[PDB]
Design a protein around this ligand. Structure first.
Ligand SMILES: O=C(O)CNC(=O)C(=O)O
Ligand SMILES: O=C(O)CNC(=O)C(=O)O
Ligand SMILES: O=C(O)CNC(=O)C(=O)O
Ligand SMILES: [Mn+2]
Ligand SMILES: [Mn+2]
Ligand SMILES: [Mn+2]
Ligand code: NI
Ligand code: NI
Ligand code: NI
Ligand code: NI
Ligand code: NI
Ligand code: NI
Ligand code: NI
Ligand code: NI
Ligand code: NI
Ligand code: NI
Ligand code: NI
Ligand code: NI
Ligand code: NI
Ligand code: NI
Ligand code: NI
Ligand code: NI
Ligand code: NI
Ligand code: NI
Lengths: 374, 374, 374
């Protein structure tokens, strides 16, 4: 029950927030308020204690910051197998990049000053205890990180002591501050984070181009040039009124829209996500199924070609630090769309001229591990 | 009258289309239909003949293509002074990049096959005659270049013979084809082009980010995360309906909007445009005026800083081939906005703490040639 | 008399400080106190006015700083011919690098705050007037630059107004401050500087190695190893007492020393100095003379070789920005020393085995312009 179940992205998330049900988490907590899961599970406490240890910092004897009396180890999933296993599963579950930072603070020391972050967090207490104080957001669902002065935050809303095996979730914009109680024991926790720049605002700006391109093919007013020197000649009343009309027309056009195109979001997720955790040949008469659907991008790029790219060979060692696929002719697009939008498809049923072309396509997909033979 | 008047961008354009009045050009021709200016000016004919010559191709003895029986010399303004002088003036006038291509076709040869272009063109006949046929657009105000089959274009709408000193204007999407009459004389013309990707559609996508950023600061619904796996899990009815609502809200928000921010259009124009054609010290008690306003970008970039960049030191030799400024603290933003939005301003009237800071600002602007002392 | 006489380094310096005699300058002023030369020479005023102009900054339309309300143009000798001519002559005269900076301050503005510099300066007033205040040094003959607070400098010792054609000399460590009088005219001056890190202390550290190398060849105590871990195991009484003895022995050894070797000073001067200002073949029976003696370094470097390097082909454009010669066998050293230490020498008189070797040596020197045929 408490033990992390790596069977599916769903079973991992369900086990991570145990005993809380996912229906409860999404209805009551997600992007709304903090969730504190205090447990009494010595097995889970031993498990959390193995995710990262103070000794792992000395097994790295750049990858960490020294903010006052706090060591921050960036992206431990680069070296810690279990965290790679957890974070990869969460990326499948959220459809968003999932990074992590380890925070180590000696006994009796204050951590970072009061602040809020731009990410949804899952804090796992690994070693020792840490005293937390949570305050009401000044900016609910903040899009940026910010420190907040103690005289602007008010009194804590939640205050508690985290111990190994405990989990704390809180949405972006939650003002917080933590300190290690005086004593012998230092504190070690991992902050697993997701949902950075994954808002409706980000999604609208990511899909707007495809919508304008489609509309302009049918509407000559969108194809019409702007007035001379508009880019240079404080703004004008004329431009805002025309743009209001265009946005209203696009809103009406969306009602009939069946497909939205991602300009960069889908592509950036696929290129940056973690690779899958690592420890039959198709024929004309076989049935195929596309596998790892949420790990693939199918785009048309310039004469144009169909491009397929996946995350199956992504570098684990570069994940979140910030510093693979195929190409086919446009004629293959109908057959590739048949594979994408089908639970299972016969190779002979593909929309290509020769039976050889059908076989070559599926053989290409199989060499990348993008298809499974049923 | 006919002679090109380089006094201002306005006087250059007025003289270029002589005897046609700019009021007539904008009301009747611009982005609507072709304008043929056939003249009887031997002085202008000699002038056009000096803009580019077949001999100039041999004075370049990559910079040109060999499309069938037509030589196309790219961007002659890189070496021809008079064309640099003309094109620079047109960039000020249009607020859009202005490139050119020279077309040389021997007597008796067909040019390029029927097609339409994605730019507004001004064709100047420099040497010999060329036989033109213009057809009705299949795609009015086309956003892309395309060849069109002779059996899809119909009969010509306009047919004429261009000779030196003649000008031909036509909007993007105009299907056309030209051939050099049989005889002794080859044809040389220059196609001055502008308004590539300068439509209302391009402008809407260029300003939309600033609008969403501003709205999301006040609207928590734009700050709210998308549903899990939306980027991956064919599109849904839910997303299109939410996006329709957001676009309608943004349209209402635009009515009250006084300023629009350019994400890239203004910046790309400034970085790529031609430099100005080339052949008093400010004090605390002096009056200053910002000069070359349409050659400057003032942006805030990340801690944030105010960045100023101009086109006054742009490379002439790289113009349109595709292969300078200052930095100030955020405190200077109010004073820089005072300079931008003022016909003339006293240095002592600037919103800065010390009189020295006021003097340093204007001295910085003067070293870049961005200010004039009144 | 007042006009700059470029006949020799001596005649240039004599004319630069006119009407002051060089005997007076060295006895009374050099490294002792300021010298103000206020003149009434309209010809010299016109001459100074041509050395650098506010317009020369716009003829550069990195090479300058913008310190508050003062523009500082670094190393104008890179582009200004007359300043190259002056500074090159001064490097011959001083045997020290001679750089310059132009200072431009608008009317009514304060210059840099009170400070002292680490160089000997010759300030030439080129355009307008500047109000100077000189104070008593806090650090006489300072080795570093430093600002000094107004409450630590006392009252001015000297106060004057510089006008075009005026010269001001002051030693390193002289606290000073200048401001442009209120009015219409900006101020332009050039600060010609020399004697940076050219002290007895610098010279002692530059020659000490050669002295220790020579002494250790004869003294086994200098060849003896230090005690184990001396470099690591706060200092000890034993080391200081031994070092006192060594320094006393070296002092006694210097009395008999006839030649001092430069570890880097001579080499750095030759590599960085300005090239000479630009607008017979030797035979066995000819008499030769080494020319540009103060532009050449003769060193033995590793099997060892004799290396000759000169400054005759130094880059003018890189002077003071901070970002040529021959090689011969060790057997040639006696003959090269004969050329160095002789006002004129017969080629046949050189200490080399064959007459051909004598001819080859002098032919090598002639190709670099290091020898003149008498
Ligand atoms: O432990 C700390 O000092 C601070 N940790 C965080 O801000 C966090 O996990 O977001
Ligand atoms: O001259 C030609 O053959 C074709 N010229 C053009 O297509 C043009 O100027 O757009
Ligand atoms: O002119 C000024 O403001 C200051 N000039 C100097 O410090 C100088 O020449 O050393
Ligand atoms: Mn128990
Ligand atoms: Mn006539
Ligand atoms: Mn006089
Ligand atoms: Ni860091
Ligand atoms: Ni935090
Ligand atoms: Ni506490
Ligand atoms: Ni990247
Ligand atoms: Ni591969
Ligand atoms: Ni194929
Ligand atoms: Ni080309
Ligand atoms: Ni064309
Ligand atoms: Ni014809
Ligand atoms: Ni570019
Ligand atoms: Ni510049
Ligand atoms: Ni300033
Ligand atoms: Ni500098
Ligand atoms: Ni100084
Ligand atoms: Ni004064
Ligand atoms: Ni150097
Ligand atoms: Ni040489
Ligand atoms: Ni020899």
């Amino acid at each position: 029950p408490s033990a992390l179940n790596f069977d599916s992205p769903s079973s991992l998330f369900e086990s991570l927030i145990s005993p809380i049900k996912t229906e409860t988490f999404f209805k009551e907590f997600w992007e709304q308020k903090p969730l504190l899961i205090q447990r009494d599970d010595p097995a889970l406490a031993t498990y959390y204690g193995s995710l990262f240890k103070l000794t792992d910092l000395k097994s790295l004897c750049k990858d960490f910051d020294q903010k006052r009396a706090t060591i921050q180890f960036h992206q431990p999933q680069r070296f810690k197998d279990e965290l790679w296993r957890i974070q990869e599963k969460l990326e499948c579950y959220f459809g968003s990049l999932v990074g992590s930072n380890v925070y180590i603070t000696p006994a009796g020391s204050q951590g970072l000053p009061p602040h809020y972050d731009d990410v949804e967090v899952f804090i796992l207490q690994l070693e020792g205890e840490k005293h937390w104080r949570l305050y009401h957001p000044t900016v609910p669902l903040a899009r940026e990180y910010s420190v907040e002065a103690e005289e602007r935050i008010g009194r804590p809303v939640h205050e508690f002591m985290l111990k190994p095996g405990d989990l704390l979730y809180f949405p972006r914009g939650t003002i917080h501050q933590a300190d290690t109680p005086a004593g012998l024991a230092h504190s070690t926790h991992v902050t697993i984070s997701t949902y950075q720049n994954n808002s409706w605002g980000d999604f609208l700006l990511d899909t707007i181009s495809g919508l304008v391109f489609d509309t302009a093919k049918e509407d000559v007013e969108l194809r019409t040039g702007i007035p001379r020197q508009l880019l240079l000649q404080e703004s004008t009343t004329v431009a805002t009124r025309r743009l209001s009309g265009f946005l209203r027309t696009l809103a009406d056009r969306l009602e009939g829209t069946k497909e939205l195109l991602s300009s960069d979001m889908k592509k950036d997720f696929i290129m940056h996500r973690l690779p899958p955790y690592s420890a039959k040949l198709p024929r004309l008469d076989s049935v195929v199924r596309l596998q790892f659907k949420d790990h693939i991008v199918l785009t048309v790029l310039p004469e144009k070609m169909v491009y397929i790219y996946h995350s199956l060979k992504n570098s684990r060692e570069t994940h979140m630090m910030g510093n693979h696929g195929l190409r086919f002719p446009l004629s293959h697009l109908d057959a590739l769309k048949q594979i994408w939008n089908s639970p299972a498809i016969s190779v002979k049923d593909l929309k290509l001229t020769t039976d050889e072309e059908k076989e070559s396509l599926v053989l290409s997909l199989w060499t990348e591990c993008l298809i499974q033979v049923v």
